[model samples]
Target: ATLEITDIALVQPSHQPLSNDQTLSLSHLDNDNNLHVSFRYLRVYSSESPSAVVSASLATALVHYYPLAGSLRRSASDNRFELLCSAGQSVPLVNATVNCTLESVGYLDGPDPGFVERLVPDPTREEGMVNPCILQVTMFQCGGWVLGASIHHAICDGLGASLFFNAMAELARGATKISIEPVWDRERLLGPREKPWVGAPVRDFLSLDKDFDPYGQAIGDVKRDCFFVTDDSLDQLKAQLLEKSGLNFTTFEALGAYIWRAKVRAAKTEEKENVKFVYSINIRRLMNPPLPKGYWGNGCVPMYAQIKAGELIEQPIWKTAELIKQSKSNTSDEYVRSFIDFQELHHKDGINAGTGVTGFTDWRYLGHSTIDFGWGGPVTVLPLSNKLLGSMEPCFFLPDSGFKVLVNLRESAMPEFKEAMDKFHKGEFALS
Candidate 1:
């Protein structure tokens, strides 16, 4: 079965709003420098007139998150992006239909990038910066439908985008008002300091490497897959790590350590090469005075745990887990300010986090299931990013029938990586 586009409409906020003008702050720009690719994903639902219901909710939701409907443009002198939130601005919503039932495809139960790619809009880089947010509601033969969205990173991060969607969901479920009204103090809240200072700690995590491109070079024969982890398996793995190290670790630290080691081993990186375990940490509350609720923008900064490839592979798994756990201590308010200052001072120096970086994000705590728009929460959520944190292969922690890990890797490494994970699950890793 294939998805077919039926109609398209620009969904303006339900009520005409004030001039939604705003400027893009330095912090709002992603570490990747205005790549302008819309982050795309889909939500599965069983409903009647799904398009009508969602479209109406989006229209109303935009009244609060109106900057989403605004256009993004660069300054005349500086190449920095700024938002031009004028009246009559609207978000494009495409109505679509699929020829099969959601069940036939297991409701996109796994990470099938090719199949899911058809469900969302892929705007050209130029169009993406301007439109910023695009949605598609596709009805299926079995009363199930998928609502897909592509949001530009320049405007907000994933959590901020989810806030808008959740508000739309609330309205769709027949709410006259919304929770957590959106705020756009981009410059005032996230703006760079007057005297920018680059510190040693911040410099260690970033470098001026103009020759290196995070998304450059074709990764050979890569495939995306989702691996399920029973609660028992995760608990057992944690217990084993605790028994080995004599220190208890959280699920993220323990699992991340295992997966990072397996990934490096599977990729066959040389002993002396350097690798980084990268993830974003929310800095909303890390500021001297915590950012106010609804102060939505890019409120997170990337954190890195670096080690030698050989050390990562040859060391005890608990040691690696401790490194990941210790990395969190680097995320204080000073670190947050230092990062912002680094961006301010080196915006033109071609700053980058560099290569051999593995990106990992845990969506389990993101509460995606609470986004019910009358039908129910989404049964599944998938990320379709090809490049993250300078790594072509990224990993995600997803909520499935059990906890699932959606991972991206080179096709050649699949057998070894799968074997490594199987051994870990069966406690064969203890012998290794």
Candidate 2:
């Protein structure tokens, strides 16, 4: 069913007149020029208008997260982003209606490609840099509704943005106090080491590719699909790997390995061409001593396992899984600092993660279910994004232990890939 936009309003903070002028740190520059991070979620309920509560709660919560309403601008000297805090700015909250029921859409538990995009307000780069955040509340015919949010990637990562939403939820639920306070010590906390050092072999992972454009590529026929990985499936895969190597592997590593291989095989890349398995790791705790509890911003960095397609395809699945498991060991206090150092030293040199990169992130651990805004909690949260971590085609590990693979490949290759994935899930890869 189609979705129709009904009303749009600027939900300004309720507190007294406030000023907004803030500077972001080097950490925020990683996503330069206003990259917007947007996603959609669904909540089922009975007559408690989420629209009214959420709208009012947002006004209250933005008093603390005031920078969200601030405009983003680039530094004239260095091109880094900073917040231009002004009075009377606000986040936009749009009200909408969907011509269907939550039951009809499976509570958004599954992917519905085109319809999902409409749930979230799509703001352009210029609009996002000015507004930074926007929300849409679309009521379904059955009293249930879906919530969509779009935030500037530079403002916060998933965890950081979740902090704000949780606070808004608290206000909606009648809590007078927010559990975690918002902090803006980005420059102090994630600042680079003096004299800038890149000692952790950044050259091996990242390179200077001035001609590379991670987002610009000819995308032939593109299709998105969601596949479920039941607990039983993960258990079986884990046990199967243990028997093979006499070493146990966690679900992320094992499935990531298998899925990476399947995707590479599906693409039918030249055996000798290099391919990368990319995902981000939160450095909040991984850093030395760790970031403070309220430090909510882009705190995760990309980690990759690079190999030749031939080597990846021909190798034992267990070995690939081992490589992914070992990648975690490379992320240390020293390595994280080195990544920052690398950014500090080479941000102007067009630091590129290069091509044929596949991005993956797990929302299962990101605490999306805890954002209860009067409704019980969101049953499903879906990402309607393709450009992620320098990869035009990215994969996401959803909360259900299942997978959603977003692929843009030559239309000719999709049939084979789809067949391969169906076999991969059916456990019939062994049969072939």
Candidate 3:
């Protein structure tokens, strides 16, 4: 199954005043590297000027590294789009240009939900599904256009991408070439250490729970949906959790715990379940063998914070946050090796993401606002993954904009999820 190349457009407009360094940087960032992981940087076009610096739409970014075979490898039926350019080894990600109509109004305001959904489209069943790295361009209202992409994740993280995008924008603004030079060391620097190192943290969040399969059969049967909430609602939820536990916690700590507990309750998970909250920590500077500043590889690793379903929800959010914070302390070179060792050891025993899992990734800290294609940063960004980190329903702590907190959940959880979300809107927001 192949998608015919339809249209390609820009998501934002380009600014003038190119700098010397911006030109140089943009060239490097957009290099079509086949051996190493790489991608293209571009600007979505528009005639009308957007009043807001940030806008929400459906554009999935991927960072793919294809091997020398020239066959494109894709993730099967994932809610999020992963367009593999060159699947295998020693190939950089691919870049594409989007063509679309420029609009001042938002895609949601238009009659069709194409622009919004295109960015966060549901997964489809297709074999050897090539990553939709270069999606067709879409036209929006007021002669505006949207940049549709299904970028891979192996090339660079969100921040690294932002740096590349900003460089492109800087060039469009006539800043000249980009200032920063990208460094690719996936094979050499990011390669595993000799003899494999193991960290003591292996005993903390996980153990030899051979039978605990995180991801099991029936992947296609699972349903997913999206939920919206308000900052006020989230604030209230935090206050209530704090009032009950008497321990103050930040929104991520308090709210993340509540969501996890609620997911377990709604899904009817086990109280003694060894479920994990799968989240990746940015270890660019944290790793003992710290990665180079220019190194844009996956400069992070998964850090699982697990707990008994019943105790976690009932406990004060502070303890949960503390667990998350303290968990990072163990992320040394040893920790990385042990995690790799765990992967190597459990590869045959069935490397499960652990069923009943809630993969939580907070995008608030990601450098989204900094990515300005001359038109400014995005007003809102969202994720479309319902089943990830081995769970059917994954949660993301997105910016509480437009009176709705973004919640990505399984389609099965949509109904109950809405009820909890609606409750937060009514009287859940904590001002105190």
| Best-matching candidate per TM-score | 1
Every model's TM-score: 0.94, 0.92, 0.67
Candidate 3 local lDDT, residue 225? 42
Order of quality (TM-score): 1, 2, 3
- Backbone Cα, N, C clashes tallied per candidate: 0, 1, 78
- Write the residue-wise lDDT of candidate 1 on 189-213 in tens digits: 7767899876776888888865666
Supply candidate 1's per-residue lDDT for 104.
Answer: 80
Candidates' C-alpha lDDT? 0.79, 0.74, 0.46
Give the local distance difference test score of model 3: 0.46
Judging by lDDT against the true structure, name the best candidate: 1
Tens digit per residue, CA lDDT, model 3, 105-143: 343332333334444222242311233233333344344
Which 10 residues in a row give candidate 2 its minimum summed lDDT?
32-41
Give the lDDT ranking, best first.
1, 2, 3
Itemize residue pairs with steric clashes in candidate 2. Answer: 20-85
